Structure formats: structure tokens, C-alpha cells
Tab-separated table of C-alpha atoms in Angstrom:
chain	number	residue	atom	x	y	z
J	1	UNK	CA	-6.248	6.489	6.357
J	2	UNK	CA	-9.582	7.592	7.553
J	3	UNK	CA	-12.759	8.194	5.011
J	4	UNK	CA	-15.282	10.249	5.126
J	5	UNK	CA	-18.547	9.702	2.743
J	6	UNK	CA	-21.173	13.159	1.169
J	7	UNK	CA	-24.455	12.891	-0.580
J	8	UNK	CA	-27.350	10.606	0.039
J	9	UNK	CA	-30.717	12.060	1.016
J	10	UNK	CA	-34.063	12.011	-0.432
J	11	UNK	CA	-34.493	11.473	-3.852
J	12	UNK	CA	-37.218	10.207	-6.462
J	13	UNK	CA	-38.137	7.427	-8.801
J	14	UNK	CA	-36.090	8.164	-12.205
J	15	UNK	CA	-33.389	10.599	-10.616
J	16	UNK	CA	-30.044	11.546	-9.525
J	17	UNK	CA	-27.403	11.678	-6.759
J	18	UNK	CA	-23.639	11.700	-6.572
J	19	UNK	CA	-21.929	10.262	-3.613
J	20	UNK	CA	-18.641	10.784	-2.947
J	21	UNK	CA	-15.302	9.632	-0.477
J	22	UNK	CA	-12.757	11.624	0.484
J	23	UNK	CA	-9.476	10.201	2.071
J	24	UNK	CA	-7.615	12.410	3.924
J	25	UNK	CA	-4.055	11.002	4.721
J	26	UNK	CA	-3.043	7.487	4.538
J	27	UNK	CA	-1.933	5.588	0.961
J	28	UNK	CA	-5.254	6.622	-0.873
J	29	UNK	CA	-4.329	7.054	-4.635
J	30	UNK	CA	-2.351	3.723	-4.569
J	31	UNK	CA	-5.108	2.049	-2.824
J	32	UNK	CA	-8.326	0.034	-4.671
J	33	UNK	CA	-11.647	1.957	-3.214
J	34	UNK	CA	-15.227	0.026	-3.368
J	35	UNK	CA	-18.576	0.587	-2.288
J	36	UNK	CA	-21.160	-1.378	-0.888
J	37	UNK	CA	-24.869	-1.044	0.049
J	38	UNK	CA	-27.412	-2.648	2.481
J	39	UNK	CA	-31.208	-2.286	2.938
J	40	UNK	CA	-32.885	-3.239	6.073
J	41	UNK	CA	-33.439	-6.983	6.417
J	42	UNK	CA	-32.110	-7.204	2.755
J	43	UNK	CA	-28.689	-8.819	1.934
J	44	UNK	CA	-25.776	-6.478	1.984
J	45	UNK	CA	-24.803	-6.129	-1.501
J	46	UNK	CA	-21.564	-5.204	-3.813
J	47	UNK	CA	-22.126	-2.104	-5.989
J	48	UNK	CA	-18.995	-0.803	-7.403
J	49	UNK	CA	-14.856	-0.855	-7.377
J	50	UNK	CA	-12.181	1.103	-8.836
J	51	UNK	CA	-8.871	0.369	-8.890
J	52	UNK	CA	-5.370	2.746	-8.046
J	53	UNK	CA	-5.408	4.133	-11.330
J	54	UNK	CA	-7.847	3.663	-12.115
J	55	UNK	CA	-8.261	1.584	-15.846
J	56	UNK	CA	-10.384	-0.802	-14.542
J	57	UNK	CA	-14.026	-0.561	-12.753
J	58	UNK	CA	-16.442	-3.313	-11.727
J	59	UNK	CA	-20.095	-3.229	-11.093
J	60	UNK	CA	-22.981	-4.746	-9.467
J	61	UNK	CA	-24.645	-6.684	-12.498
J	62	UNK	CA	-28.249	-4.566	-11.734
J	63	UNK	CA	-26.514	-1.312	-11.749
J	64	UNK	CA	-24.515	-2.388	-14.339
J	65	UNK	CA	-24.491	1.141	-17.475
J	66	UNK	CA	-26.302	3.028	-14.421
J	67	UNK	CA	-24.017	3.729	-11.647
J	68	UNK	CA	-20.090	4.871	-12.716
J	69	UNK	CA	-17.267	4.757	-9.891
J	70	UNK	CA	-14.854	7.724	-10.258
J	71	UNK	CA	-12.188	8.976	-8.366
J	72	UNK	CA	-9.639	11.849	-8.264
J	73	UNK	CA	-6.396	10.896	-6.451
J	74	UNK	CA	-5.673	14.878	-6.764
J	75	UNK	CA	-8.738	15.398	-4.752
J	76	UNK	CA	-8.425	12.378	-3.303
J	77	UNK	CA	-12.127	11.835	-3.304
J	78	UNK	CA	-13.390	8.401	-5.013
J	79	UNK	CA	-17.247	9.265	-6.115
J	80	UNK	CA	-20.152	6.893	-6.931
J	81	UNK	CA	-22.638	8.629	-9.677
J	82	UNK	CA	-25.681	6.910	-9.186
J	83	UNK	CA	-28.667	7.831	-12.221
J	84	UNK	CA	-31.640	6.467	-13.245
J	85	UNK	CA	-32.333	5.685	-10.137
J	86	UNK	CA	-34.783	2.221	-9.203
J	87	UNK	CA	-36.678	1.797	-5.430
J	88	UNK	CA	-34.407	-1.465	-5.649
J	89	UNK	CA	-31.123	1.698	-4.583
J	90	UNK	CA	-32.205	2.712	-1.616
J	91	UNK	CA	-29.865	2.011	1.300
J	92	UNK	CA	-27.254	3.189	2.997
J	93	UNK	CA	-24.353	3.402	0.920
J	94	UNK	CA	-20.608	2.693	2.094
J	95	UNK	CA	-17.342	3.167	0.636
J	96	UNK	CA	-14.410	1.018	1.439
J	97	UNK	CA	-10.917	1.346	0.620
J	98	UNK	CA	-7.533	-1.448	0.715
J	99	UNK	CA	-3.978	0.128	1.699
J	100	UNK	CA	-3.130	-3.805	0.991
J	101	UNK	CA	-3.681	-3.771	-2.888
J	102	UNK	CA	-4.398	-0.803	-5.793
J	103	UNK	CA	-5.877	-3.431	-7.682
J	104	UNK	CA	-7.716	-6.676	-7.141
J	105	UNK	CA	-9.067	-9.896	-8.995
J	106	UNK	CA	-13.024	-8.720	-8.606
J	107	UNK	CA	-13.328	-12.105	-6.817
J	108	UNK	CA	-11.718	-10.285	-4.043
J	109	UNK	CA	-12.836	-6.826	-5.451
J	110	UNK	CA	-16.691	-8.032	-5.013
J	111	UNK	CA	-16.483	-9.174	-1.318
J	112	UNK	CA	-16.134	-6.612	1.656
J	113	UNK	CA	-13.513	-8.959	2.892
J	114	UNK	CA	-10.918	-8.150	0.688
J	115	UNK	CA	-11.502	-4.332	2.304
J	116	UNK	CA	-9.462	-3.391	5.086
J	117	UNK	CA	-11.097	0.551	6.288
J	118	UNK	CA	-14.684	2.513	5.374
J	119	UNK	CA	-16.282	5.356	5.362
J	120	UNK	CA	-19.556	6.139	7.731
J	121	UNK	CA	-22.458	5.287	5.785
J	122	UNK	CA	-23.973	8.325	4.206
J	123	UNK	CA	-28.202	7.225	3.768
J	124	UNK	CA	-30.083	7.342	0.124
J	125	UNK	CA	-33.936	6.800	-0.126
J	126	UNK	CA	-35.189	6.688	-3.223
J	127	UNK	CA	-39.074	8.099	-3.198
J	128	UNK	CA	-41.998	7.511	-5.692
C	1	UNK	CA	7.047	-18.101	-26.445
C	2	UNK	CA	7.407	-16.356	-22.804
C	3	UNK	CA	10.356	-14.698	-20.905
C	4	UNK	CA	13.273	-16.162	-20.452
C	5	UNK	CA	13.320	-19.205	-17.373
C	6	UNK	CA	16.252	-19.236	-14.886
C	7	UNK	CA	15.709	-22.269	-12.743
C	8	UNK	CA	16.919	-22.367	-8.955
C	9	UNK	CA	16.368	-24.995	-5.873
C	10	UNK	CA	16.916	-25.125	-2.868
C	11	UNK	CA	16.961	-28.831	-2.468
C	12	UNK	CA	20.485	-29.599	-4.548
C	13	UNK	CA	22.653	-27.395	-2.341
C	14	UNK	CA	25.472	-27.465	-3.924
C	15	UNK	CA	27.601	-24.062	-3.746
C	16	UNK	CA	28.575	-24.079	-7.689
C	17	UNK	CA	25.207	-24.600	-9.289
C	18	UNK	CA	24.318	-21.268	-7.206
C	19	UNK	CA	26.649	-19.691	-9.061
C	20	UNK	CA	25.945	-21.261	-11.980
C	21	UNK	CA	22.320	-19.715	-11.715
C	22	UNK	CA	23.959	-15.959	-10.517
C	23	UNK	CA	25.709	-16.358	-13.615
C	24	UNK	CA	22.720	-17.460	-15.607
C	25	UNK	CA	20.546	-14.423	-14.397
C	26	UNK	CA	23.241	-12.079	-15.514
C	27	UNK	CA	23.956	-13.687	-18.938
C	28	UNK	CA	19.974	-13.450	-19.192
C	29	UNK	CA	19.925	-9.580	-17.769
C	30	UNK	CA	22.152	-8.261	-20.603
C	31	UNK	CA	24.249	-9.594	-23.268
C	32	UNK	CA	27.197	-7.677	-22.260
C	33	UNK	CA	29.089	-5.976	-25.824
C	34	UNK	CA	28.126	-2.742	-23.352
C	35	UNK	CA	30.961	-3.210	-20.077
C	36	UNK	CA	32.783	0.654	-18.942
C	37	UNK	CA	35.757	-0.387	-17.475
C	38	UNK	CA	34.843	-4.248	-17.647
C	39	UNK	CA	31.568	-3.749	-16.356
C	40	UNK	CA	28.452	-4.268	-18.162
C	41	UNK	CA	25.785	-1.908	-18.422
C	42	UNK	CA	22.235	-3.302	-18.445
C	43	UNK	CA	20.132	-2.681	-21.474
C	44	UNK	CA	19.010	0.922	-21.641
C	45	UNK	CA	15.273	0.444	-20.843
C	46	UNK	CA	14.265	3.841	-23.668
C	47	UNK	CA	14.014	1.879	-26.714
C	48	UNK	CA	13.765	-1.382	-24.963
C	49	UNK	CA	10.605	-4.124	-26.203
C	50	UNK	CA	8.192	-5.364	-23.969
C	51	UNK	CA	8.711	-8.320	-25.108
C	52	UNK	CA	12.661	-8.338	-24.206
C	53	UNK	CA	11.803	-6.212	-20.687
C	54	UNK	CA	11.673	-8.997	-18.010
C	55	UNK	CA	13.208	-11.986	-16.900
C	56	UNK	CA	11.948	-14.932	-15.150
C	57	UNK	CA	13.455	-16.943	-11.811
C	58	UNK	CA	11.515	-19.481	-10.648
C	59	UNK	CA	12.409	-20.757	-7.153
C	60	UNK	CA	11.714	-24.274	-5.648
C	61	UNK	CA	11.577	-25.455	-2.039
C	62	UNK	CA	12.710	-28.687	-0.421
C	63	UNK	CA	9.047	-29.007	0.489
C	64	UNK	CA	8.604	-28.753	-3.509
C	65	UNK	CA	7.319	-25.204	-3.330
C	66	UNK	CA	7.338	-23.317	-6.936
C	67	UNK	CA	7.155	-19.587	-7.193
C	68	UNK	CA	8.152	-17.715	-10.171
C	69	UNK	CA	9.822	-14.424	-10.174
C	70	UNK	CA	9.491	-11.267	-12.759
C	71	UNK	CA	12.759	-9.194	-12.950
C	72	UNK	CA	13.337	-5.956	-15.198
C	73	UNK	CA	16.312	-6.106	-16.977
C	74	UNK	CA	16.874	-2.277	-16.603
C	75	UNK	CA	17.410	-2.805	-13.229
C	76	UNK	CA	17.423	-6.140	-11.863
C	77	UNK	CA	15.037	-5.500	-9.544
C	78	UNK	CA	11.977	-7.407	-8.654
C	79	UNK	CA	8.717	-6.372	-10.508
C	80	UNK	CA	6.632	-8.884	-8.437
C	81	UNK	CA	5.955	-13.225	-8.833
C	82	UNK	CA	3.511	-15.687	-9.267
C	83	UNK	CA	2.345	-18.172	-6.643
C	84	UNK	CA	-0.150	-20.956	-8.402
C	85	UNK	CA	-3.017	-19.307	-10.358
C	86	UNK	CA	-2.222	-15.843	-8.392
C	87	UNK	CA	0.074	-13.259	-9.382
C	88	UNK	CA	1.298	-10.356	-7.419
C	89	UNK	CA	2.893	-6.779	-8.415
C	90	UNK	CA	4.875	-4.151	-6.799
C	91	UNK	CA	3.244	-0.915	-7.484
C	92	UNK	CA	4.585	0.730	-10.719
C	93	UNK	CA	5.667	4.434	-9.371
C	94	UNK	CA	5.192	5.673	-13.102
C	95	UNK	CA	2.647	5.278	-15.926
C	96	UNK	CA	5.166	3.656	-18.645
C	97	UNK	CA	6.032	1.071	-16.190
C	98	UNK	CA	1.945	0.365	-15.109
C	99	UNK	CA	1.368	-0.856	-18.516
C	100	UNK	CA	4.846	-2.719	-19.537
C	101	UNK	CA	4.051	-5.492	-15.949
C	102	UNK	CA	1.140	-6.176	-17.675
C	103	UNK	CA	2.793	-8.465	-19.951
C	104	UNK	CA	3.670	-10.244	-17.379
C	105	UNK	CA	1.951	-13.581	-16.343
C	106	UNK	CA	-0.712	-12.984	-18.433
C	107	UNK	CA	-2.597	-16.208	-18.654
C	108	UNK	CA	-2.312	-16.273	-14.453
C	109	UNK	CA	-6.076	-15.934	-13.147
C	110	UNK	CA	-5.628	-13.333	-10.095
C	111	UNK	CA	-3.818	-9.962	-11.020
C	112	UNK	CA	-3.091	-8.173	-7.734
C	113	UNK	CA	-1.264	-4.878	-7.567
C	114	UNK	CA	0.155	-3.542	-4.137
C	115	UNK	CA	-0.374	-0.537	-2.808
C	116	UNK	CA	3.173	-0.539	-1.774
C	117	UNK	CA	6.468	-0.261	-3.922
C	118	UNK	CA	9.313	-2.808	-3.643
C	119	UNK	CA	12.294	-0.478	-2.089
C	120	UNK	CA	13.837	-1.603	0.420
C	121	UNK	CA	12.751	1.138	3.176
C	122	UNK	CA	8.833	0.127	2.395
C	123	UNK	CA	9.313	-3.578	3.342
C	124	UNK	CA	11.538	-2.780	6.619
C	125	UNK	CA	8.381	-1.436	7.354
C	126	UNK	CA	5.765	-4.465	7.153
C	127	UNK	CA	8.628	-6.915	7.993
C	128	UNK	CA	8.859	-4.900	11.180
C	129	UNK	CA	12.471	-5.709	11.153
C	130	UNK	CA	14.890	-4.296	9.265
C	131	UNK	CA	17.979	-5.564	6.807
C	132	UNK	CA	20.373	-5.004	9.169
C	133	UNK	CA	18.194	-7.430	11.326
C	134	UNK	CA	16.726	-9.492	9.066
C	135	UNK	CA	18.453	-13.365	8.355
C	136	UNK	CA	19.707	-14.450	4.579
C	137	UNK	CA	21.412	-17.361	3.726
C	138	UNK	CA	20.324	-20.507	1.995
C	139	UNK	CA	18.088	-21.471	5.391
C	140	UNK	CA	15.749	-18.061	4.884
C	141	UNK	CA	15.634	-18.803	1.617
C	142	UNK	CA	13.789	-21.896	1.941
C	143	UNK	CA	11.093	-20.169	4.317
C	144	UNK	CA	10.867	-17.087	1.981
C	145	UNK	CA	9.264	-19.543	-0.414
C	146	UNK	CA	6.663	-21.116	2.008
C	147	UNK	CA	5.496	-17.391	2.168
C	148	UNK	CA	5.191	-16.260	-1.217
C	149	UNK	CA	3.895	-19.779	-2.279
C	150	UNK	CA	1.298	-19.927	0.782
C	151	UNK	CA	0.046	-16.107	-0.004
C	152	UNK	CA	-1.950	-16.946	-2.517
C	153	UNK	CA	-3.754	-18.686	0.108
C	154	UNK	CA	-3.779	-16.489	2.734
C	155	UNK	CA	-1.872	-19.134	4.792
C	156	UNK	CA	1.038	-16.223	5.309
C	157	UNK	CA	1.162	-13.023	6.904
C	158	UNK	CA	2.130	-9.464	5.417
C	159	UNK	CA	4.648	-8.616	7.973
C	160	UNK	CA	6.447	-12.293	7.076
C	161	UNK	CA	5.462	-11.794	3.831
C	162	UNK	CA	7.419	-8.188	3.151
C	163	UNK	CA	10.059	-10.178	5.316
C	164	UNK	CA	9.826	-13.026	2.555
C	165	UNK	CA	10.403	-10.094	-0.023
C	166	UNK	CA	13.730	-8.866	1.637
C	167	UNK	CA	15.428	-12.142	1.732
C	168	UNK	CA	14.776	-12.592	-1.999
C	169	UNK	CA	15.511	-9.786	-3.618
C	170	UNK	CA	19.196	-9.470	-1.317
C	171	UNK	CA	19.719	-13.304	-2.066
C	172	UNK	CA	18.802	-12.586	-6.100
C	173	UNK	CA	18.711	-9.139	-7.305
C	174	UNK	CA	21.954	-7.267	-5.166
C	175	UNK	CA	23.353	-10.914	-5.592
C	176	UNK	CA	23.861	-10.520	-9.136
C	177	UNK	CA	24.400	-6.838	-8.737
C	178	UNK	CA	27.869	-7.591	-7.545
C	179	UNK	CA	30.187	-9.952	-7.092
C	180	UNK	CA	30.928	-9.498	-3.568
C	181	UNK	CA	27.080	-9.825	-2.461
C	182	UNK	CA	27.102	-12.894	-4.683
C	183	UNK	CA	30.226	-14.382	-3.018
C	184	UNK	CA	28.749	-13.526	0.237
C	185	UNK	CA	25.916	-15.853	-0.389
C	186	UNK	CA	27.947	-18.775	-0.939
C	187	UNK	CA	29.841	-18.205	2.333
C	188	UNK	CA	26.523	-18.938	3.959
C	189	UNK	CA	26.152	-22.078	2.054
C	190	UNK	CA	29.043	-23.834	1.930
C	191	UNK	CA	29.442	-24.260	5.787
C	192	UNK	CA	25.605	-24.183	5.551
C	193	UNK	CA	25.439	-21.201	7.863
C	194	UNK	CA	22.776	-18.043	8.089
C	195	UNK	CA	22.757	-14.287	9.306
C	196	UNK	CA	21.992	-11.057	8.640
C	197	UNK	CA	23.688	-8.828	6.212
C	198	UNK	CA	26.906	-6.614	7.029
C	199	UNK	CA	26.880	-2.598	6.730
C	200	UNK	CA	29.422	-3.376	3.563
C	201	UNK	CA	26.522	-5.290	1.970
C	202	UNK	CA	23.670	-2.720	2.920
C	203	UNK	CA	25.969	0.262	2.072
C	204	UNK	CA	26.280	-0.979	-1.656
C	205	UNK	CA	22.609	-1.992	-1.709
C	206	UNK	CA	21.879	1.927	-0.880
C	207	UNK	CA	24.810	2.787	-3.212
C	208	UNK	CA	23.826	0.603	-6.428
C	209	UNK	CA	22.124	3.142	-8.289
C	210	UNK	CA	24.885	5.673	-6.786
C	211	UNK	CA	27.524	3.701	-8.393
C	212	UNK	CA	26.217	3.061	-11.800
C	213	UNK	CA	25.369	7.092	-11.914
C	214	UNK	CA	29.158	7.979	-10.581
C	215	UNK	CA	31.154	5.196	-12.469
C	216	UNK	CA	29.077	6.157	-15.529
C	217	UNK	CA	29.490	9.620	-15.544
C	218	UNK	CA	33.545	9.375	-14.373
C	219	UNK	CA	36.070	10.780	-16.215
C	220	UNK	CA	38.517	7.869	-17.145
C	221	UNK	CA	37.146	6.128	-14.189
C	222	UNK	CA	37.682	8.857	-11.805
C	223	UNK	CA	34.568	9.472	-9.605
C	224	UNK	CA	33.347	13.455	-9.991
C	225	UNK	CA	32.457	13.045	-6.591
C	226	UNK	CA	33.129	10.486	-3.299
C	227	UNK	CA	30.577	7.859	-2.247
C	228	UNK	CA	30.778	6.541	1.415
C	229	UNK	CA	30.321	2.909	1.842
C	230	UNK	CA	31.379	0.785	4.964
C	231	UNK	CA	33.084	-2.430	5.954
C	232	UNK	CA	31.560	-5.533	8.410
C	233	UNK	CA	33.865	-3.208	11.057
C	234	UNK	CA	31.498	-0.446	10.314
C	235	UNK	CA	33.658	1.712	9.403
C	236	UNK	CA	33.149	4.487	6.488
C	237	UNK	CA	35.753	5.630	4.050
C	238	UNK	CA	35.102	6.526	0.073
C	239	UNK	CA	35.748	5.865	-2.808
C	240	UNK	CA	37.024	7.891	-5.726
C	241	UNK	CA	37.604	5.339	-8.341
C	242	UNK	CA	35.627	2.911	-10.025
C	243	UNK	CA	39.170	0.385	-9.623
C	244	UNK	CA	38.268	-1.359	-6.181
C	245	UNK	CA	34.609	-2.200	-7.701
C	246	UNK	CA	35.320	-3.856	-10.247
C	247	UNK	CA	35.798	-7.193	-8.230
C	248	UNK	CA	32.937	-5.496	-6.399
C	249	UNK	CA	29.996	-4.566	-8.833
C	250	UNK	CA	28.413	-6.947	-11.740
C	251	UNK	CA	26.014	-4.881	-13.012
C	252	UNK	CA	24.819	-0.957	-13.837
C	253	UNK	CA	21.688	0.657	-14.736
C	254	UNK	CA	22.221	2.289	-17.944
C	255	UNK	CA	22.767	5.984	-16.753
C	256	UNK	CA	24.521	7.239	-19.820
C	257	UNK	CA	25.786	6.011	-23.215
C	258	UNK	CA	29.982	5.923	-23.772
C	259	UNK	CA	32.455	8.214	-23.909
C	260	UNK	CA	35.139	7.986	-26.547
């Protein structure tokens, strides 16, 4: 399955984007999605994951009751809603799904080993 | 306390106490007092509790290798195991069944789901053989364990892995499905031999579910309909009457309640 990532652009201290991933073919809908951020010269960093389902969410403890992970397994799109947003978000965002497993431990589910294809990187700057 | 414990090694080879465990599983996957035509139905699973919904097989090596197994009692089938602190699941097709596997291996420490179901047709994918190529027996039953156990670790591969599923579920589920797949197990043992299966095994895997809906649903036995099977010569022919398996078949999913 091959993913393809919308959103991200040019936005301002305190505001709001939605990012989104949308799977065409492959297993998506039984497969766990995540996403995963890096700034220049700063550490690559977990943000979010969803499971098949999806009961079950995890989040990066600083965007922790900021960003929510959704997805839509009719649309087969997985989005990231990202408010309230800090100069800490900006970077380019990516979103990375498992045909191995709908669900994982969140050991697993926080490292971008566990992730077996991505999206392209859609950018987000985050002005002020 | 927990489900039910059916215990099984590899190391004692001794062709009774494999029967002794087929027979345990089955005593364990209904209670019989529910047989059409001397066959027992398994429990209907509408109605069923949670906490009487699974059975557990746990499996040991001769290189002391413990894996336990999660079966439904509906259908005998394999729900997924447990390998040390990990525990792995087949993906649950429907929503009722996503939140029953739950129950299962709670206090384990890593959850994982599959993406993948546990049919048959799935795992002769990832095995990248297929049944009619794939070797059972007591020997692959050994190495089947080595996999699941060494998973958890990331010390075995899918493709072996989904191989590792095939044996199992043959050499347990279909084994205690009938009587002729179970007998066929012990053939490998006793002379301590191994091989693939035969188109008369794989032909009643396929036609479990077949079976149980057309011996079921027969009037006074006799099959509304024919269901092709075939013999280790290959050759097909039906059969119209549930008669030839009752030496044959062990178990049925519940497909309807009793007649007069």
C-alpha cells in the first residue's frame, strides 16, 4: 500500500491545521497508522498512533490534549488534527503505516521501527 | 481463575498421550449432551460467556520452549498465543469478536493484533508455500515452536512464522476436528515419520464448516446437497450422507439447533 500525506503550510502562533493520509490499496483499515515529525538538526520525534479500529490512540507527551489522530477506514484517510499550535510543531510531518500489525504495544507503536511504509512528508511552519 | 489448560510436549513422544491430549481438547471444547447423529455440536457461541469462550493449549519443545495457545470453542480455531511477556492475535473479522480476545491473556505485557486473519489461504501466502507443500508431523511440530516462542524476539521470520501457524493449527485444531486428521497425526509419530498433508486431509479442512452446515441442516442424515472431497489418490467423489463421517468428523460448529 502506498500513502500519500495533505495539509501543512504556513501557519501562526496559537492556530490550526489538519493533516491527513490517504491509503489507496493495500491492507489499510486493518493496519496500525502513526506519525512522526523532525525539525532540522532536531531529533526526529514520535507524535501520534492509532490503531485498526481504532479504540486506542497514543501521543507524544508535549502534544499530549492538543493533537488527536483520526482515521476513516471508509475513506481510508488516517488524519492528524493539530490545534493550539506551539513554534516547538514545526517540521515536516510524516505518516507511517504497518500491514504487519492493526495494533501495537506503544513500545513498538512509539518507534518508527515498528513501521514498515510512509507517506512523503507534507511541511508545517508554524509563524509568530 | 483463567481458561481452561490443556498441556502438550513434544519431548514424551509417546503416540497415546497425543491422543490423550486430542481427547482432552475436545472434552474441554464442548461437553457433548449436544451430538446429531453421534456427533457433538460445539457450544453455540450466541448466548455463550466470555468467560466460558476460549480454551487454552500450551505447547512445549524438547529445547523446553513454552507457548500457549487461545482456541474458541465455537470453532476450534486458533484466536492467536502467547510467547513470554508477548501476546499475539489474529485479526477479529467482526466487532463482537474484537472485544471477546480481549479477555484473553490479559495480564501479558505486549498486546499485538495482526493485520492478517488466521484462514488458511492468508498464511499460504506469508509461508510462501502452501498446505499441500508444507511438512506436519511430530518433527514440524517441534520447529513450529522455536518460531512462535522466538517471535517475541524477533529471532523468527514472518514467512516461517505464518509457516509455524499452518503446522499448528492442522496438527491441533482440524486434528480434533476429526478423527481421521487426528489418526493421521499419529501415523507420523509412531514410526516417527513427517510429510505434507494429503488432498483427503485438505479437502475436509476446506469442507469443515461445509459439513457441520450440510450434516446440520440434513434431513435424517441425508445431505440436501453433495459435497466433493478427495482421497490421497486424488480422486473426487461426494458424499450424500452424514454415515461415512462419522468415523470421519469429531466436531461441528453449531449451525442450527435439533430437529425432533
Amino acid at each position: 500500500v502506498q500513502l500519500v500525506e495533505t495539509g501543512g503550510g504556513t501557519v501562526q502562533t496559537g492556530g490550526s491545521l489538519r493533516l491527513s493520509c490517504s491509503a489507496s490499496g493495500g491492507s489499510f483499515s486493518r493496519n496500525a497508522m502513526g506519525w512522526f515529525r523532525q525539525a532540522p538538526g532536531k531529533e526526529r520525534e514520535f507524535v501520534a498512533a492509532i490503531n485498526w479500529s481504532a479504540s486506542s490512540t497514543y501521543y507524544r507527551d508535549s502534544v499530549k490534549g492538543r493533537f488527536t489522530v483520526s482515521r476513516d477506514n471508509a475513506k481510508n484517510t488516517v488524519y492528524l488534527h493539530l490545534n493550539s499550535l506551539k513554534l516547538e510543531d514545526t517540521a515536516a510531518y510524516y505518516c507511517a503505516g504497518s500491514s504487519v500489525y492493526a495494533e501495537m504495544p506503544y513500545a513498538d507503536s512509539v518507534k518508527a521501527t515498528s513501521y514498515n511504509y510512509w507517506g512523503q512528508g507534507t511541511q508545517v511552519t508554524v509563524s509568530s | 481463575k483463567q481458561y481452561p489448560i490443556i498441556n502438550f510436549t513434544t519431548a514424551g513422544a509417546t503416540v497415546q498421550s497425543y491422543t490423550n491430549f486430542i481427547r482432552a481438547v475436545r472434552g474441554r471444547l464442548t461437553t457433548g449432551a449436544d451430538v446429531r447423529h453421534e456427533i457433538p455440536v460445539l457450544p453455540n457461541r450466541v448466548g455463550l460467556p466470555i468467560n466460558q469462550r476460549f480454551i487454552l493449549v500450551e505447547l512445549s519443545n524438547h529445547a523446553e520452549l513454552s507457548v500457549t495457545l487461545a482456541l474458541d470453542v465455537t470453532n476450534a480455531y486458533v484466536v492467536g498465543y502467547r510467547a513470554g511477556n508477548s501476546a499475539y492475535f489474529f485479526h477479529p473479522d467482526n466487532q463482537e469478536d474484537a472485544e471477546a480476545i480481549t479477555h484473553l491473556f490479559t495480564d501479558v505485557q505486549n498486546r499485538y493484533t495482526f493485520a492478517f486473519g488466521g484462514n488458511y489461504d492468508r498464511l499460504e501466502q506469508l509461508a510462501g508455500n502452501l498446505r499441500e507443500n508444507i511438512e506436519l508431523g511430530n518433527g514440524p511440530l517441534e520447529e513450529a515452536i522455536s518460531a512462535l516462542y522466538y517471535y517475541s524476539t524477533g529471532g523468527t521470520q514472518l514467512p516461517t512464522l505464518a509457516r509455524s501457524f499452518i503446522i499448528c493449527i492442522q496438527m491441533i485444531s482440524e486434528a480434533a476436528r476429526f478423527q481421521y486428521i487426528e489418526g493421521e497425526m499419529r501415523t507420523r509419530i509412531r514410526y516417527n515419520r513427517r510429510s505434507a498433508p494429503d488432498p483427503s486431509v485438505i479437502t475436509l479442512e476446506n469442507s469443515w464448516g461445509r459439513l457441520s452446515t450440510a450434516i446440520q441442516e440434513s434431513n435424517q442424515g441425508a445431505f440436501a446437497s453433495p459435497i466433493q472431497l478427495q482421497r490421497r489418490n486424488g480422486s473426487k467423489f461426494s458424499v450424500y450422507d452424514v454415515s461415512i463421517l462419522i468415523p470421519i468428523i469429531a466436531l461441528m460448529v453449531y449451525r442450527c439447533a435439533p430437529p425432533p
